[PDB]
Assembly symmetry: C2
Amino acid sequence: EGELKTIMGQAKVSKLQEKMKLDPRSKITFNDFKGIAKEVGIEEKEINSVSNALAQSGSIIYLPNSLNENLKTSVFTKPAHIYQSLEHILDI
Amino acid sequence: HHEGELKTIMGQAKVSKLQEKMKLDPRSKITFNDFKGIAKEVGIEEKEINSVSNALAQSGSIIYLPNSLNENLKTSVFTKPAHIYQSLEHILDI
């Protein structure tokens, strides 16, 4: 509702992005992503909404509906390389 | 979406390039119309801009407050909001 609450809620998701940049892993379980998010004050009640906003923003790749077991539970935290590689090998 | 992994990823790649453009742009505050222009430069249609701008705000990549009553905030996009987050926590100690 109010501007400050909005900005401060958003700041947590920015700190989430910061932590994922510094983590050396590029692929983590959703359970691990949940835990990093908790570290910056994002509760489990908000995690589905935050993951959907990060996926639509292009900031993570997360494919919970995939039939592949690997992809279904995995969060790609540095997707930029994946986007670039895909456009190159498929010549988009 | 079941079975749309490749379609999902490449649609996301457009918004990723939009965040790239905004990191490289030296401006830290632009109008929403300028933002729309930049998004269309990476191939994001007018029809998806409101959903893209919502996902970017919720992920903390922009500040965009269309419901504000301050006319300037209402039509402005903050493209490097990390400095604002940090400053706000600093000056209000929260």
